[PDB]
Design an enzyme around this catalytic site. Structure first.
Site: not given
Length: 226
Positions: A123, A206
């Site tokens: 990621e 996020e």
């Protein structure tokens, strides 16, 4: 525009080239985003999150395949070694409250099927802005100059390799950012293998606490193969 409040709600946008996901994957607190269907631009209109040290959600727009759900004719997944150029543009509107980041999330894995996630892969995040003292996972292992700016490099060895490039000073927009420069750096560090596949390029926020008012706009991703 349409307002999406479902936990896993989504809309294909820009003729199917991109997809916007509400993606409240880490909490059960309410969240809505208002999405422009032609561009994929979206504003977070409601975000009741107060999740402590864990990410509550990641409303995002993406190109490629996110957990098996792929956009139209993206050309992904494609092996890293077969990529010649990967560029992206984005404009974000920050707020002054809450705990959140504005970051790209780019997924890689050794296999072509992403329905069960990216275990054994990587990621790669690119943090452009943030508020509230949030920091990337892992530990800071370097600071490097790439694609016109300076970035802290954070790494964590989890189920997949986590690599986050955090800009040394925040910004609110990028135009034709060279994503390949980051991929090449991560490959040089041994965090991504050339034989692995790039599955998706995503960007969004996020959220740990709050987030209403954040806006994502002008998203574009292009990929050129060798």
């Amino acid at each position: 525009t349409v307002e999406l409040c479902g936990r896993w709600d989504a809309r294909d946008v820009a003729g199917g080239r991109y997809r916007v996901i509400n993606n409240v994957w880490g909490a059960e607190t309410a969240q809505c985003i208002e999405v422009g269907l032609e561009t994929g631009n979206f504003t977070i209109t409601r975000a009741d999150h107060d999740n402590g040290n864990n990410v509550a959600a990641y409303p995002a727009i993406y190109f490629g395949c996110h957990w098996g759900a792929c956009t139209s004719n993206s050309g992904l997944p494609r092996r890293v070694q077969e990529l010649s150029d990967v560029r992206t543009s984005w404009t974000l509107t920050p707020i002054t409250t809450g705990r959140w980041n504005a970051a790209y999330d780019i997924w890689f894995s050794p296999v072509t099927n992403s329905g069960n996630g990216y275990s054994g892969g990587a990621e790669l995040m690119i943090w452009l802005n943030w508020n509230g003292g949030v920091m990337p996972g892992g530990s800071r292992v370097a600071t490097v100059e790439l694609a016109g700016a300076t970035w802290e490099v954070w790494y964590a060895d989890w189920d997949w390799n986590y690599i986050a490039y955090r800009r040394t000073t925040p910004t609110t927009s990028v135009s034709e950012l060279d994503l390949k420069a980051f991929i090449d750096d991560a490959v040089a560090r041994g965090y991504i293998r050339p034989e692995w596949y790039l599955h998706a390029v995503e960007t969004g926020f996020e959220l740990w606490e709050g987030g209403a008012g954040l806006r994502s706009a002008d998203f574009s991703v292009t990929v050129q193969k060798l």
